Amino acid sequence: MYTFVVRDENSSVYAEVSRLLLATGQWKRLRKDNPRFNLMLGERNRLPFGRLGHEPGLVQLVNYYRGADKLCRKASLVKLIKTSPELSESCTWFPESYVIYPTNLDEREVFLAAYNRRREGREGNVWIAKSSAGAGILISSEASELLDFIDEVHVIQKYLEKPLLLEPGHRKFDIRSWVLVDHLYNIYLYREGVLRTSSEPYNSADKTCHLTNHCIQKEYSKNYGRYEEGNEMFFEEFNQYLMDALNTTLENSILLQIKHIIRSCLMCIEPAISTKHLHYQSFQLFGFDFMVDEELKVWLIEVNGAPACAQKLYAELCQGIVDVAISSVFPLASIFIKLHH
Amino acid sequence: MEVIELNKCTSGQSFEVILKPPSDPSLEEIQKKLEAAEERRKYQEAELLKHLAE
Amino acid sequence: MREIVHIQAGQCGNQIGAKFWEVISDEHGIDPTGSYHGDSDLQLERINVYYNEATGNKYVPRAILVDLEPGTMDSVRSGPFGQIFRPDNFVFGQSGAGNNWAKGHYTEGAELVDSVLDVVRKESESCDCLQGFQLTHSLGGGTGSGMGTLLISKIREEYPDRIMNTFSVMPSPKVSDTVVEPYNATLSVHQLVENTDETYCIDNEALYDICFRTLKLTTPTYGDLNHLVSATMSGVTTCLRFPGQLNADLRKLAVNMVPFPRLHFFMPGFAPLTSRGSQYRALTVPELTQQMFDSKNMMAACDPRHGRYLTVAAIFRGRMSMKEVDEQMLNVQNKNSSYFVEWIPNNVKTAVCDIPPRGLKMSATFIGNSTAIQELFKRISEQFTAMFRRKAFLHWYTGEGMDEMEFTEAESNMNDLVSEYQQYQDATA
Amino acid sequence: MRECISIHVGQAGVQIGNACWELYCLEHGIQPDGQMPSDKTIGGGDDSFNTFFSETGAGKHVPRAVFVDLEPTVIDEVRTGTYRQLFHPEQLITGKEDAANNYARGHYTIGKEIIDLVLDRIRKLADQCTGLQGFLVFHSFGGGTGSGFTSLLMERLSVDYGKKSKLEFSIYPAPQVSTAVVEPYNSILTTHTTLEHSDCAFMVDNEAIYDICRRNLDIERPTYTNLNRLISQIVSSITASLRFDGALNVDLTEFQTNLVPYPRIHFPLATYAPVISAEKAYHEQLSVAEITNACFEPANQMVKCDPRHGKYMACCLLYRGDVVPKDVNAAIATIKTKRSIQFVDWCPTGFKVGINYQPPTVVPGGDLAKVQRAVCMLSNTTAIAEAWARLDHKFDLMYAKRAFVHWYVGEGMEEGEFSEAREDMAALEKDYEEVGV
Ligand SMILES: CC[C@]1(O)C[C@@H]2CN(CCc3c([nH]c4ccccc34)[C@@](C(=O)OC)(c3cc4c(cc3OC)N(C)[C@H]3[C@@](O)(C(=O)OC)[C@H](OC(C)=O)[C@]5(CC)C=CCN6CC[C@]43[C@@H]65)C2)C1
Ligand SMILES: Nc1nc2c(ncn2[C@@H]2O[C@H](COP(=O)(O)OP(=O)(O)OP(=O)(O)O)[C@@H](O)[C@H]2O)c(=O)[nH]1
Ligand SMILES: Nc1ncnc2c1ncn2[C@@H]1O[C@H](COP(=O)(O)OP(=O)(O)CP(=O)(O)O)[C@@H](O)[C@H]1O
Ligand SMILES: Nc1nc2c(ncn2[C@@H]2O[C@H](COP(=O)(O)OP(=O)(O)O)[C@@H](O)[C@H]2O)c(=O)[nH]1
Ligand SMILES: [Ca+2]
Ligand SMILES: [Ca+2]
Ligand SMILES: [Ca+2]
Ligand SMILES: [Mg+2]
Numbered sequence A: 001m002y003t004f005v006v007r008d009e010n011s012s013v014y015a016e017v018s019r020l021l022l023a024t025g026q027w028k029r030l031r032k033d034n035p036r037f038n039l040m041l042g043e044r045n046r047l048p049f050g051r052l053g054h055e056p057g058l059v060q061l062v063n064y065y066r067g068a069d070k071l072c073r074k075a076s077l078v079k080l081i082k083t084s085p086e087l088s089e090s091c092t093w094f095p096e097s098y099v100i101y102p103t104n105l106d107e108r109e110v111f112l113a114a115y116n117r118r119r120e121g122r123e124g125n126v127w128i129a130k131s132s133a134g135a136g137i138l139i140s141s142e143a144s145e146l147l148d149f150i151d152e153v154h155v156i157q158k159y160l161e162k163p164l165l166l167e168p169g170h171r172k173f174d175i176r177s178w179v180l181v182d183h184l185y186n187i188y189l190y191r192e193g194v195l196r197t198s199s200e201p202y203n204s205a206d207k208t209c210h211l212t213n214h215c216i217q218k219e220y221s222k223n224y225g226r227y228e229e230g231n232e233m234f235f236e237e238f239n240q241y242l243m244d245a246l247n248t249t250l251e252n253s254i255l256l257q258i259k260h261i262i263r264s265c266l267m268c269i270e271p272a273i274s275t276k277h278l279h280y281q282s283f284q285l286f287g288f289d290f291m292v293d294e295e296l297k298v299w300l301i302e303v304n305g306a307p308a309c310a311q312k313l314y315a316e317l318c319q320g321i322v323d324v325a326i327s328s329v330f331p332l333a334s335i336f337i338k339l340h341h
Numbered sequence B: 001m002e003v004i005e006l007n008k009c010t011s012g013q014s015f016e017v018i019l020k021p022p023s024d025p026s027l028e029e030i031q032k033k034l035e036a037a038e039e040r041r042k043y044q045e046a047e048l049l050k051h052l053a054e
Numbered sequence C: 001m002r003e004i005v006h007i008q009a010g011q012c013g014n015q016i017g018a019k020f021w022e023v024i025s026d027e028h029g030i031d032p033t034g035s036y037h038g039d040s041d042l043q044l045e046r047i048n049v050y051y052n053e054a055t056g057n058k059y060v061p062r063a064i065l066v067d068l069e070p071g072t073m074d075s076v077r078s079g080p081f082g083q084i085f086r087p088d089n090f091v092f093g094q095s096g097a098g099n100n101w102a103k104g105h106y107t108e109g110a111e112l113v114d115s116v117l118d119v120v121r122k123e124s125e126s127c128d129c130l131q132g133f134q135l136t137h138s139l140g141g142g143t144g145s146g147m148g149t150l151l152i153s154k155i156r157e158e159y160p161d162r163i164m165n166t167f168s169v170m171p172s173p174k175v176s177d178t179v180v181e182p183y184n185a186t187l188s189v190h191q192l193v194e195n196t197d198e199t200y201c202i203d204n205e206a207l208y209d210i211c212f213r214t215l216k217l218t219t220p221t222y223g224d225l226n227h228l229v230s231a232t233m234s235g236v237t238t239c240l241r242f243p244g245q246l247n248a249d250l251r252k253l254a255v256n257m258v259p260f261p262r263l264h265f266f267m268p269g270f271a272p273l274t275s276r277g278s279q280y281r282a283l284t285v286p287e288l289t290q291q292m293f294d295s296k297n298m299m300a301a302c303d304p305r306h307g308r309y310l311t312v313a314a315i316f317r318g319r320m321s322m323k324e325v326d327e328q329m330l331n332v333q334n335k336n337s338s339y340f341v342e343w344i345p346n347n348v349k350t351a352v353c354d355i356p357p358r359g360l361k362m363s364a365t366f367i368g369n370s371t372a373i374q375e376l377f378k379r380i381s382e383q384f385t386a387m388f389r390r391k392a393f394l395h396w397y398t399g400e401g402m403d404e405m406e407f408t409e410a411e412s413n414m415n416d417l418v419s420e421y422q423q424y425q426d427a428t429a
Numbered sequence D: 001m002r003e004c005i006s007i008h009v010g011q012a013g014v015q016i017g018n019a020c021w022e023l024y025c026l027e028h029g030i031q032p033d034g035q036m037p038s039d040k041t042i043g044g045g046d047d048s049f050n051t052f053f054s055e056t057g058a059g060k061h062v063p064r065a066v067f068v069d070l071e072p073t074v075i076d077e078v079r080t081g082t083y084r085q086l087f088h089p090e091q092l093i094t095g096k097e098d099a100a101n102n103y104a105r106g107h108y109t110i111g112k113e114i115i116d117l118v119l120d121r122i123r124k125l126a127d128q129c130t131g132l133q134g135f136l137v138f139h140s141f142g143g144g145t146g147s148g149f150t151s152l153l154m155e156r157l158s159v160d161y162g163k164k165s166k167l168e169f170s171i172y173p174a175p176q177v178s179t180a181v182v183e184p185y186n187s188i189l190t191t192h193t194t195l196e197h198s199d200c201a202f203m204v205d206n207e208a209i210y211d212i213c214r215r216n217l218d219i220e221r222p223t224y225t226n227l228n229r230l231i232s233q234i235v236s237s238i239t240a241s242l243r244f245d246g247a248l249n250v251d252l253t254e255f256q257t258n259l260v261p262y263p264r265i266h267f268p269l270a271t272y273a274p275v276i277s278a279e280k281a282y283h284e285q286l287s288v289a290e291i292t293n294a295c296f297e298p299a300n301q302m303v304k305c306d307p308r309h310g311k312y313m314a315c316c317l318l319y320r321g322d323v324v325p326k327d328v329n330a331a332i333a334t335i336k337t338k339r340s341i342q343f344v345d346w347c348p349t350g351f352k353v354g355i356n357y358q359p360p361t362v363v364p365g366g367d368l369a370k371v372q373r374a375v376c377m378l379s380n381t382t383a384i385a386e387a388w389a390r391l392d393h394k395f396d397l398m399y400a401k402r403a404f405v406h407w408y409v410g411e412g413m414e415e416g417e418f419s420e421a422r423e424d425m426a427a428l429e430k431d432y433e434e435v436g437v
């Protein structure tokens, strides 16, 4: 009989993982403050990692990697990619970003130096400002309007002016991939991703057709649910569109770059967060968000440390978590693509 | 990577390696707290012996 | 040296107390004449905790035998180890107590208590550093219950900084049929709540069930019951009589086991449960560990799964894997973590002694401070109230000068004790 | 030459002190009777080992040590031990009844009756000192004497020796070998009252030592003797700079200068390598780079914590044996590019290094194998605050219900000292998070 505690009630993914563990008859749920657990489904903020691995006779496992916030915060991600030699400032798959602190509190001068080079060079000079404290996003071409909005920590990155637009619709989208890193730091990519598509045509000259968020497309967008159910296009439909419209495949034109970016990010922080020789073990589910331009180039947007799943894929993904990340440590009585490294 | 202040002798040696530059109460107050605690003990024992006398 | 002074009062107290000295004398290699004949230096390393040394290298139990009638103490003196006790430590009257707490506490016992305290004082003066006292007695009778609790109160007056520990035998209608035992027990429990640091609840109800149901003793005797008591008393005092790190003296035991001063009533447990003259198959460490926590091995008729453990002490005896003991102990806490309060971290302590008891390759003794002990006090309280609501049989006590208000207060204190266990059973972190 | 006096309080302090002074004698070649044949200045001198040993006209080398325990059965082992002739009875102080795992009993009730005798015996050793540096205090966090009497003694030492340094070797409680449920209470009470009186304190978690003994020495159920022999090796590595010729950490003040920039944050994390079982008939001798890299593995630390998720304020490497500065500088360079070593901005990312050519001495018949080179890293990292957080959480769980509190109030202590001690610890955790995050 294995034991586990639950310290995050709002986790739709791990609420189902909890339901699956109890349904096995070999897992018992304890009170949230009972220290004699095998598994902790911890909270998002201030998880007491320092208290794990100090129970005699108990192998303890937690569903979060301490230090993974370096990859899952806006300002942290930019600083990580710029300052890590494994990723370097010459990183080709991450949009040119700059960390901007409000003046009431930095890379302001460096942000303007590369900004004037675009105005002088007759190049597309459209940027976007955002932060980890969002629902507040501004998309402007004048840098004077971007810096004024931050003062009212944010990051400014280059806005992909030429995105890949699905037809019919001439509409934007983004790709969400679910990645599971186990206690051995094996990197597993869930075979099923989702395209959170826009239902409005992209107007290159309003932030409804530009921001592909599921909440914004269900509010400000008038054509919600027209082309696809819930503005969620799955891999089978998207692979068929790429074959019929572009004579390519999802695997060749996009997924190779996606798997490459996933490996590069997680291998970069492996020495800092690995629990290999530690007194407790970690795993974590990550949500990677990508953009594809018209030339079928994949760009990384951000990484989510506490991702939510799509309704159709909850049952299969949460079952794979138990099989690969939980029951691998606690055996009882493949939907993932292993990204070897 | 700079080694500075290398000191040597017969039983060993010591040095410093720099990889990057940088970016009470008195005895009177003690006895007053000790005696104030002993006073609380004697008071508690006195209330017990009073209780037992009843 | 940290000496303990032992007192046994009344019939039950003297019979159980005599078996205790008989059992630990054999464990420490002392013969009925007080001469050491053992073959191990561990038997003598802490011998001074319970014995005094005399001329001719004689070891005399630091024990005081008290009764208001000479009957049982004549049986002790003529018993197997009767010649080992100090003759001047036999303090006895002639009237008896008539199973009357008031006679033991207020009239008959008052006449004899001063001569007992003189023997106590003589023993306590020849102690390098006395740690405290242990008393054996029943709560259902008159001498052990009434005079025993009078002795505890007067000893506490003279030695208010010493530990008071009792082995208190709770009455049961399955064993005795004297109707006033719930009165005597309730009056005694009120005394114990206030004037002892640790009380081992030895429930005749549980001893009967073990003997009758488990050992298949269809005609149980007190010798059968006292066999369980002797093994348990040996087990819970092992940490006092042999070298060890855990709960080596009475005060360190109390600090570990008593989180709130009134909740100091322990459920003892023992494994393996054996009858006199009965052991071919040796018990394994997993078996000892599961049995010592089994409700059927508890010496108090309380279901541990109906409450929560505040603190637990576990003592393993015999030659065994201390690694395996740790593994099995950790397994119980990790597989039954709901029955342990979470607001007392690491509340289970384990000791191991290489010297096993007589006739057993290995054994385990359980000491639990569980909120389930409220079931014992609820049982006595219901028997008390059934009679007291009609003042039935009260004239036996008012005839000795007692007032009904003293019964109301004892009843209220015991119901308050039950409420206190109940509040720490529901508390949460 | 400047003398150091070691003070051993309670069972843990006395049994560890016994293992240390046994090891000190083997390292300096001092016989059980106190005779040191290699000492040519009979009856005196100012060699480096004289900081820990005094000398008599007959050639006996006597530890500058005081043993205190409120109960005599542990110190009686020293009075009849192998090295009984080293000490004179004036150095061994015993009471009759211990503190019963009760801080308040050791600090207020029983401490008040023996504090004056201990200070007098300490003053007798101080009078033999031409230039006393200060004191090294060995005690447990969990016992009533180790927690309660120590904090009382440290307050009096700060009064009677206001200019002398005071260093601690403190045993942090671990349930695998602990003997009291209230040890989280005693640890936080003694840390609160000793904090302003200690200049540098080396915490040793019994859990870390226990697992190192199980993992690396193949001991199924380590005893105190197993743990104390390993602890004495770490203590020996730390004090070697005071007893031998050298230039790093040559006096007690230099410990605070090299390791403690902020006075309250004076708990350096110790890491030791290698720990090799003597049961192995042959073992591959690890290189300078291998033992230095092991200093950044949590399984070799004296307190389990993750220094990757904190910041360093200082770091010292203390090598013993076949070690040359060339191989050290290379190992540090390799490690800096592979490990997550972050210093605070107001400190240089650097390492103070000391090398002692004499290889580590092991006790004959012990569990540790002889090695050609070993290292003890002393790093002041904010990650050690994980141990304060674990301790404070156990405190909070019990104090929320006032469990066992009556044992302390009954000894004269006020319930307000509990919350006052806990608020001080909460301020300590806040200091650590500011420096390290
Ligand atoms: C361990 C001490 C002990 O020997 C334990 C029991 C009783 N006493 C005295 C000896 C004794 C017992 N029975 C006796 C009959 C006549 C004379 C003496 C006895 C004793 C026994 O050995 O039975 C074979 C016994 C007695 C009882 C006994 C069990 C018992 O031993 C098996 N009881 C459980 C009760 C009893 O009241 C009861 O509730 O039984 C269900 C039981 O009632 C019945 C219907 O049997 C009974 C039987 C005499 C009736 C009236 C009141 N008393 C109170 C205790 C109880 C008994 C065993 C002391
Ligand atoms: N490493 C090590 N730890 C010890 C040793 N002895 C005791 N301890 C630890 O110290 C704590 C108990 O404190 P003690 O030092 O034994 O008690 P004390 O200082 O003598 O105080 P008293 O309560 O009066 O007995 C527990 O955490 C033990 O695990 C020892 O010899 N070595
Ligand atoms: N540099 C960029 N170029 C083009 N589009 C961009 C962009 N940065 C953001 N976007 C658009 O904005 C949308 C929302 O961005 P973002 O992911 O930062 O919000 P968010 O992080 O709060 C939602 P989630 O947490 O699910 O990722 C993206 O889906 C994308 O369509
Ligand atoms: N376990 C046990 N209980 C006993 C023994 N003798 C008496 N009792 C119980 O004690 C109670 C009677 O008290 P008793 O000691 O005989 O009266 P006292 O002499 O006035 O103290 C009843 O509940 C009996 O069941 C005994 O030897 N062993
Ligand atoms: Ca008379
Ligand atoms: Ca000399
Ligand atoms: Ca000072
Ligand atoms: Mg986000």
Ligand SMILES: [Mg+2]
Binding pocket: C011, C012, C141
């Ligand atoms: Mg009788």
Ligand SMILES: [Mg+2]
Binding pocket: D010, D011, D071, D098, D143, D145
């Ligand atoms: Mg002690």
